[PDB]
Structure formats: structure tokens, C-alpha cells
Amino acid sequence: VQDALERALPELQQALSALKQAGGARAVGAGLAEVFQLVEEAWLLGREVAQGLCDAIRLDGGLDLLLRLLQAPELETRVQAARLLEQILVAENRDRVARIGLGVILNLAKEREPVELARSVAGILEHMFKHSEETCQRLVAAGGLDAVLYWCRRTDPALLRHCALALGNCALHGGQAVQRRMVEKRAAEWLFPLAFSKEDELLRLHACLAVAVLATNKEVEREVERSGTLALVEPLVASLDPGRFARCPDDLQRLVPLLDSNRLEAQCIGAFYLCAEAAIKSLQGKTKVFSDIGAIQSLKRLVCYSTNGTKSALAKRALRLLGEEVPRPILPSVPSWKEAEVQTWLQCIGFSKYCESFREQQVDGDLLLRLTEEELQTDLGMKSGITRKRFFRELTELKTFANYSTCDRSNLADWLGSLDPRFRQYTYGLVSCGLDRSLLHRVSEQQLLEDCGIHLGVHRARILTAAREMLHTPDVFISYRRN
Amino acid sequence: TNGTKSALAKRALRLLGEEVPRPILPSVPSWKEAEVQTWLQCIGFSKYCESFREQQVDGDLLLRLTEEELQTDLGMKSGITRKRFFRELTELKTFANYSTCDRSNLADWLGSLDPRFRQYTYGLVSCGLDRSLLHRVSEQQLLEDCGIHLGVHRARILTAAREMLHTPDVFISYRRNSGSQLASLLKVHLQLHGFSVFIDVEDKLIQSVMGARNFVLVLSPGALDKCMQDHDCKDWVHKEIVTALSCGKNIVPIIDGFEWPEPQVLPEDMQAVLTFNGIKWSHEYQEATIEKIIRFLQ
Ligand SMILES: O=P(O)(O)OC[C@H]1O[C@@H]([n+]2cccc(S)c2)[C@H](O)[C@@H]1O
């Protein structure tokens, strides 16, 4: 199964021996080109083949030789060395470059003019940003991010693709400080042209992934929206097809937060990526990765509470690609729910164990929407406090997405949402108490806690203060025939 | 958090007969069940891994775990064991990525108060509090909701909070393919310099041009080829040009790969605009070209 490696490792040996023994610039460049072509041919097969290639390169100290060729005054030797570097930056070699090879790449980032150097250092910076948080912070402190922005100012397709993927990788693996520094350097504004360029679909897809990952950081969503690059995410996702790019585990674990980001653009990007990855995995026999991560539950929750056609379609396609039953979307009129709707919501939220208990109690929309802790503990047999807290989190999520028009008279849900998007869950409690916009000026804390079910004191205080501060002969007659 | 320290620790563990632990993802609020399990084997609580799995504890439930839940639901009878688990949880909460939930960077404020105060960031966020809301928080609310059991920490947080807390300018006319890159670069550069520019993606077209303080059409290679001899006003770009001419806004065309069309083949409206001077676009000096455009602009 590895005879290719068996007769390719000696070829690596003579290639590196000739490259090291070469003293002329042209001979070194030819050796680097030979190694790069061999690596490309191995890649066209082979993940394990390339891993074996890079293991031998690291063991023989080839990357140190590439570093000192990057330090060499000759430009073309540098271009071949960086061509090899882009394709030899595997995880172990990435660790080696992080530990000793860093700092040399900043000197390349100082160079800006050549297109080949731009592309090569963009790829190298992409791989380095995929390494770890500390390396991302160090590169951001250096001129790597500025180099990425300058290359984004450029026009070359491959350079733009590598820059977009670098920004996506650094946003994914950077942390709070890295994203803050990126936005302070106007990362989304320079991401905008990459997504706007109609020449290549993959460039826009990567730029939109980077924008969505930045948007998942919701402490800077204001400036991200000020950039305005989030707008193009949804139309591009709608236009593009998962199958074409699919045909063309940690990454999935990082994409899952985009699914649970509660931001429409981020959710759409995550759904598109997960659908493509699910198609790729189902092309093979290995499909248990999504189940192990738990993205199936996220997809089911996305389908049940879907509000966008494109996102719902992508989630349904991703679920159908796997061996999971698609959940039928829930009717938003929760107060009007019958027993069957409550049951269906229960299988959607993965509480099929308690479906029979709910059926025996004959819980319907009103009883479910006014369910309390003690009723769950005693009547429904939900002994575990952690399970009860999970159920109440699911119920809060349901109450956020609910149609209260059958019960709300003063549109109090809109007022509660204006106060805070998470405050809308108390709309049904406030309505069942008989309260409306006019009546909230006289409500007390004790009444709220006892009747409206607002257990959190902070929410009660905010609602009370905000309510108190905000609240204070016909002309013509018709004479007509029967028909 | 340091590469050298992590490498040394991994080498030391590998020298012995101990499995190296995979580093934990700092985004604790976004943790799934598997991440909680992995943290459990890291902190040496493999006995309770099955109990955590049965309760299906995830990032949020773990990060908001309470004493009674551990005592009853998870079967952590020993108070000493519960205190050790809470010490480990505090250590985890100190090193956590709250960006998915923190909006006002309240973790930074809590850390500025005290490095050990950052553990309450998730509680304060889940309560809905931020920097602006902390001025009105009370002791009882903190104790009941935010989970700050230590009275000294509550008093310090309250006192410290109370003491500390108290018409687009330019419109872009571009072609579908040739003008897209140049339009994107122009708009982004103008926004970087403080110029508000509205670039779209008929009735809305007229209002968009009317609201534009200045009109800058992108004369991309073959930009006016479709607008050439367009006396029927079929092209939407033609509509934009005619509306801008009717409004008479400041027009500063940018020259790239195309020349001024002959007035005779063009309608008189765009015959008028052909007299305006254009600025050559340089790929070698894009920022310099934008600076020149701004210098010629207001
Ligand atoms: O997946 P990992 O090990 O984190 O990194 C991927 C590395 O493999 C190289 N590559 C992958 C595919 C095809 C070619 S030609 C090259 C990339 O340059 C990257 O450095």
C-alpha cells in the first residue's frame, strides 16, 4: 500500500543531496523544482505519501536549508525555496517553523513587489496562521497582516485565494485579541473585494467564510456591519452550489460554532461548508465524524427553527446526505399548539425519552409554554437538574421564536425584544398575567417574580426600570339593487 | 499558551509512560460533549466521565454548573471532591474565550479589577449584563444570578463598577465583470479614508443616484461599450449616468483601459459629461491613485 513511498524516499534522498551539494543558484533552483514537482505528484495520488515526504524533509533538516535559502540574496533561489515551502508546511513542519523558522518569513513579508513572492509568502502565512494562537498573535504583531492586506490590494487570482484562506485560518485560530487587532486594521473592508470579485467562486467563498468567522465574534459585529461585507454572504451562498465545490475533524469542530452562531450569514456559511464536507465524507465510508462532534443535532435544530429558505435547504440537503431523518419545521404559533406539535418539538430537541410522559400529562401549547421547574421535576419525571436546565434552555429558544399574535394585544413581544432579544421569552408570561403596554407602568417586582415567571432578578429590574422610563352619523348612504 | 513551554512539557511527558493530552479549545462556551469529556480526562476526573455523558453536559452547562447539580445529578458526593472540581472549573474559566458571548469585553474589565475575577464573566454575560448595565447591579442580584458566592468579590465588583462607570458621498457605476475589481478597490479605499460610498450589490436606481453626494463612474476597459449608442436607455448603467447628469453631481471619472467615446454616437446627455477630466488608475500605485482622487475630491 506504500510501495510508492518505498521507491520515492530514495528519490527524496538523492534530490536533497543534489540540492544541498549544488552551489550555483540555477542548480539549487533546479533541485528545488524537482522536489516541488515530486511533492505535487505525490499529492495528486496522496495524503500519507506527502506526510512521509515531509517527515523525511524535516528529519534531514531540509526546512533549515530552505530557510537559509530564503536568507540568500538570490531572488530566484528564494522563489523556488518558497514554492517548496508552501507545499511542505504540514503540521509537524508547521511546528518546526513556529519554533525556529519564524522571523525569516517576516523578512519576506517586507518584500512586496514580486507577484511570485507575494503568492508564496501568502501561502506560507496561511499555513502558519493555521498553526496555533501564539503564532497568530506574533504574526499580527509583525507585518504579516499588513502584507496580507497589501496582497489583497493586488489582483492575482492565486494570491487572492491564498490571502483569503490565510485570513480565514487566522480568524479561526487566533482568539479574541487576534480578531480585535484584525478589525482595528480593517480586516473586513479588505475582505470585501475578495468576496466581490466575480472572477473566481472559491475566492468569494473563502472571503465569506472569513467574514462569517469574524461575525461569530459578536463583540465586534457592529464594526463588521459598518464594513458592509456581510451583505454579500447570503446571495453568494444562494447562487453557489455545494456539489461543484465538493467535487472540486478540527476544521469541522471549528465550523460547528458557525452553525450555532445564531447569525444568518454565519449559519448559512456553516451550513454550506458542512453540506460540502458531508457530501465528501459520504463519498467515502467514513461518516461518523459529524455524529462524534454532534453537528447532527445542530443541523436538526437549524431545520426546526429555520427562517431562511437557503439555510433551511442547505441544512436539509446536509442531513439527507447522511443517514438522519429531516425534521419537519415547527409551527411558530406555539400558544395554539396541540399535543402532536409538542411531541414533534420533543423529538426535534432530542427528548424522545420524555415524549410518553408528556403524552400522559396531555401537555399542549399553553401548558408547555407555562411549564415550571417543579412540574418537570415531579409530574414529568425529569429528575436530573442538568436535564431540566437543558430543557429550559430549549424552551427559552422556542419562546424566542414564537408567534404570540393569538395572545399578544399590544405587541408586547416587540417591546421586550427592543429591550433585549433574550427578553422576548417572557412575552407569554406577561400576556397570561393580563399585562400589556399600558399596564406595565404599575407592575411591581414581586408580581413579576411570582406570576410572570421571570426568575432572574436582573431581567426583572431591567424590565421594571425600562417600562417606568418609557411608558411615562354616516357621511354617505348607499342605495343599491340586490344583484 | 507558550510554544516553548508546551513543547518542553510534551517532551517530558513523552519521555515517561504518560499519554500527552491534546490542548483544549479556549472557546469553552462553544464546547460540545466531547470537549467536556476531554477536559475531564485532562483534569483527572475520568470516574465522572460517564456521569457527565449521561447528563449530556456541554460548554454552557459545564460553565454554569452549580454545587447542588454536582452533589445530586452528577453523583459527586464528596465535598472535598466538589471543591477540587470547582477549583479546576475556576482555572478553566480564567483561560476561556468568551468572544462568542461577551459583547462589551467585560472579561477585560474583570481581569483589570483582578486576574481571578475573570471567572465570573460567563455568569455576568448569561445574566445579560454588560459594561453599561453594571452601574445599576445590586448585591442580591449578583449573588443569586451571577453565581459570585464570595461576598468580598461581590463587594469589590459593585464598588469598582460604581466608581468606574460613573446619503452616500460617492456612487459607483461599474460593469458586471471588468469593473467589479476596480469598483471594489475604489469603494474600500474611499471607506478607509472616511468617505461613505454606496455600491449596489430602476426606481431605486434613481433615488440611489440622487442621494449620492458625488458621482464617480468607473471607466473600466470597455465600460461604456454597452452604454455606447444607448439612446433607448436600456442599460441600468445608462440610467445611472443620465440621472447623475440630471442631478449634476461632482463627476471625477477614473481612466483605465478605455478611451472617451465619440460624442456624436452618444446621446447629448452623456455628450455633456465627456468633457470632464479623468484620472488614470495604476495597479503599481493604487493607494497613491486613491490619494490623488481624494485630493481632487472634497
Ligand atoms: O492539512 P494539513 O497538514 O494541516 O496542511 C496542509 C498542507 O499541505 C499542503 N498541500 C495540500 C494539498 C495539495 C498540495 S499541492 C499541497 C498545503 O500547502 C499545506 O501546507
**Cross-strand bridge partners of residue B198:** B171
Which residues lie below 8 Å from residue A104, measured CB to CB, with a gap of 6+?
Answer: A67, A70, A71
| Tally of CA atoms within 13 A in the half-sphere of A418 that contains its CB | 8
CB B223 within 8 A of CB B175: yes
User: Coil, strand, or helix at residue B250?
Assistant: strand
Contact call for B103 and A293, based on CB within 8 A: no
A127: annotated binding-site residue?
Answer: yes
CB A421 within 8 A of CB B108: no
Spell out a b/e string for A370-401, using b for 16 or more CB atoms within 10 Å of the CB, else e. Answer: ebeeeebeeebebebbbbbbbbbebbebbbbe
Which residues lie below 8 Å from residue A15, measured CB to CB, with a gap of 6+?
Answer: A31, A34, A35, A38
**Which of B6, B65, B94, B185 has the highest number of chain A CBs within 10 A, making it the mutation to test binding with A?**
B185
User: Coil, strand, or helix at residue B217?
Assistant: strand
Q: What is the DSSP secondary structure assignment for residue B214, as one 8-state letter?
A: E
What residue's CA is closest to ligand 1, atom 7? A90
CB B59 within 8 A of CB B35: yes
Which grid cell sits at B97?
474565550
Q: Which residues line ligand 1 (CB under 6 A)?
A: A 40, 43, 86-87, 89-91, 127, 130
CB B112 within 8 A of CB B133: no
* 3-state SS track over chain A: CCHHHHHHHHHHHHHHHHHHHCCCHHHHHHHHHHHHHHHHHHHHCCHHHHHHHHHHHHHCCHHHHHHHHHCCCCHHHHHHHHHHHHHCCCHHHHHHHHHHHCCHHHHHHHCCCCHHHHHHHHHHHHHHHCCCHHHHHHHHHCCHHHHHHHHHHCCCHHHHHHHHHHHHHHHHHHCHHHHHHHHHCCHHHHHHHHHHCCCCHHHHHHHHHHHHHHHHCCCCHHHHHHHCCCCCHHHHHHHCCHHHHHHCCHHHHHHHHHHCCCCHHHHHHHHHHHHHHHHHHHHCCCCHHHHHHCHHHHHHHHHHCCCCHHHHHHHHHHHHHCCCCCCCCCCCCHHHCCHHHHHHHHHHCCCHHHHHHHHHHCCCHHHHHCCCHHHHHHHCCCCCHHHHHHHHHHHHHHHHCCCCCCCCCCCHHHHHHHHCHHHHHHHHHHHHCCCCCCHHHHCCHHHHHHHHCCCCHHHHHHHHHHHHHHHCCCCCCCCCCCC
Burial class of residue B152 (count of CB atoms within 10 Å of its CB; 0-12, 13-18, 19+): exposed
User: Coil, strand, or helix at residue B251?
Assistant: strand
A129: annotated binding-site residue?
Answer: yes
Looking at chain A, how many residues does it have?
483
A339: annotated binding-site residue?
Answer: no
Q: Which of A37, A41, A43, A124 to mutate to test the pocket of ligand 1 (most atoms within 8 A of CB)?
A: A43
B19 catalytic per annotation: no
Contact call for A386 and B69, based on CB within 8 A: yes
Which grid cell sits at A239?
447562487
Write out chain A residues lying below 8 Å of B100, CB-based: 216-218, 257, 261
- The residue type found at B219 is L
Which grid cell sits at A77?
533561489
Consecutive H or E run containing B161: helix B151-165
CB B65 within 8 A of CB B80: no
Alpha carbon distance A54, A28 (integer Å): 19
Whole-angstrom CA distances from A251 to A173, A230, B50 are 10, 22, 27
What residue's CA is closest to ligand 1, atom 9? A87
State the helix-helix crossing angle for A187-196 and A157-174, rounded to 10 degrees. 140
Residue with cell 411558530: A332
Alpha carbon distance A336, A330 (integer Å): 12
Burial class of residue B263 (count of CB atoms within 10 Å of its CB; 0-12, 13-18, 19+): middle
CA nearest to A221 within chain B: B103
Write out chain B residues lying below 8 Å of A197, CB-based: 180-181, 184
Q: Determination technique for this PDB entry?
A: cryo-EM
Comparing CA positions, the residue from B41, B136, B132 lying closest to residue B88 is B41
Alpha carbon distance B288, B295 (integer Å): 10
Alpha carbon distance A400, A386 (integer Å): 21
* Number of neighbouring beta carbons within 10 Å of residue B27: 21
* 3-state SS track over A94-161: HHHHHHHHCCHHHHHHHCCCCHHHHHHHHHHHHHHHCCCHHHHHHHHHCCHHHHHHHHHHCCCHHHHH
CB B214 within 8 A of CB B180: no
- B257's torsion region: left (phi>0), alpha (psi -120 to 50) or beta? left
Contact call for A385 and B25, based on CB within 8 A: no
Alpha carbon distance A415, A422 (integer Å): 12
Residue A41 main-chain phi, psi, to 5 deg: -65, -40
Comparing CA positions, the residue from A343, A354, A350 lying closest to residue A381 is A354
Burial class of residue B86 (count of CB atoms within 10 Å of its CB; 0-12, 13-18, 19+): middle
Write out chain B residues lying below 8 Å of A257, CB-based: 27, 30, 100
Residue A89 Cα to ligand 1 middle (Å):
7
Which residues lie below 8 Å from residue A465, measured CB to CB, with a gap of 6+?
Answer: B136
What residue's CA is closest to ligand 1, atom 17? A87
* Number of neighbouring beta carbons within 10 Å of residue A85: 27
Alpha carbon distance A365, A47 (integer Å): 53
User: Coil, strand, or helix at residue B258?
Assistant: coil
**CA trace torsion B157, B160, B162, B165 (10° rounding):** -110
Comparing CA positions, the residue from B185, B3, B98 lying closest to residue A179 is B98
Alpha carbon distance A347, B287 (integer Å): 57
Start-to-end CA distance of chain B, whole Å, equals 49
Spell out a b/e string for A131-163, using b for 16 or more CB atoms within 10 Å of the CB, else e. Answer: bbbebbbbbbebbbbebbbbbbbbbeeebbbbb
Alpha carbon distance A62, A26 (integer Å): 18
Alpha carbon distance B224, A239 (integer Å): 27
Give the number of the atom of ligand 1 that is nearest the alpha carbon of residue A127: 20
Comparing CA positions, the residue from B210, B219, B205, B196 lying closest to residue B276 is B219
CA nearest to A421 within chain B: B128
CB A343 within 8 A of CB A353: no
List, as one string, the DSSP characters of B170-213. EEEE--SSHHHHHHHHHHHHHHHTT--EE----HHHHHHHHH-S
- Between chain A and chain B, the number of residue pairs with CB atoms below 8 A apart is 128
CB A352 within 8 A of CB A317: no
Give the number of the atom of ligand 1 that is nearest the alpha carbon of residue A86: 18
Alpha carbon distance A43, A84 (integer Å): 13
Alpha carbon distance B289, A38 (integer Å): 43
Start-to-end CA distance of chain A, whole Å, equals 89
CA nearest to A235 within chain B: B201
E strand spans, chain B: 170-173, 197-198, 214-219, 250-251, 254-255, 279-280
Q: Which of A45, A125, A127 to mutate to test the pocket of ligand 1 (most atoms within 8 A of CB)?
A: A127
Alpha carbon distance A45, A1 (integer Å): 12
Residue A53 Cα to ligand 1 middle (Å):
12
Residue with cell 466521565: B49
Residue A251 Cα to ligand 1 middle (Å):
14
Alpha carbon distance A173, A246 (integer Å): 23
How far away is chain A from the Cα of B259, in angstroms, using its nearest Cα?
22
Comparing CA positions, the residue from A230, A196, A228 lying closest to residue A210 is A230
Quote the radius of gyration of chain B (alpha carbons, Å).
31
Residue A91 Cα to ligand 1 middle (Å):
9
CB B162 within 8 A of CB B135: yes
- Report angle CA B201, B202, B206 to the nearest 5 degrees: 90
Comparing CA positions, the residue from B76, B244, B119 lying closest to residue A385 is B76
Comparing CA positions, the residue from A148, A271, A159, A152 lying closest to residue A209 is A271
Residue A41 Cα to ligand 1 middle (Å):
13
Alpha carbon distance A17, A19 (integer Å): 5
Whole-angstrom CA distances from B137 to A319, A416, A441, A462, B291 are 45, 20, 21, 10, 49
Write out chain B residues lying below 8 Å of A190, CB-based: 188
Tell whether the torsion through CA atoms of B176, B181, B183 and B188 is positive or negative. positive
Which grid cell sits at B88?
479546576
User: Coil, strand, or helix at residue B215?
Assistant: strand
Catalytic residue among B35, B69, B91, B240: B240
What residue's CA is closest to ligand 1, atom 5? A90
Alpha carbon distance B159, A461 (integer Å): 19
Write out chain A residues lying below 8 Å of B68, CB-based: 385
How far away is chain B from the Cα of A175, in angstroms, using its nearest Cα?
7
Alpha carbon distance B119, B107 (integer Å): 8
Write out chain B residues lying below 8 Å of A217, CB-based: 99-100
Consecutive H or E run containing B113: helix B106-113
CB A382 within 8 A of CB A391: yes
Quote the radius of gyration of chain A (alpha carbons, Å).
29
Contact call for B192 and A186, based on CB within 8 A: yes
Residue with cell 399542549: A364
Contact call for A386 and B180, based on CB within 8 A: no
Alpha carbon distance A377, A382 (integer Å): 5
Contact call for B188 and A235, based on CB within 8 A: no
Residue A203 Cα to ligand 1 middle (Å):
17
Tell whether the torsion through CA atoms of A220, B180, A274 and A165 is positive or negative. negative
What residue's CA is closest to ligand 1, atom 15? A40
A409: annotated binding-site residue?
Answer: no
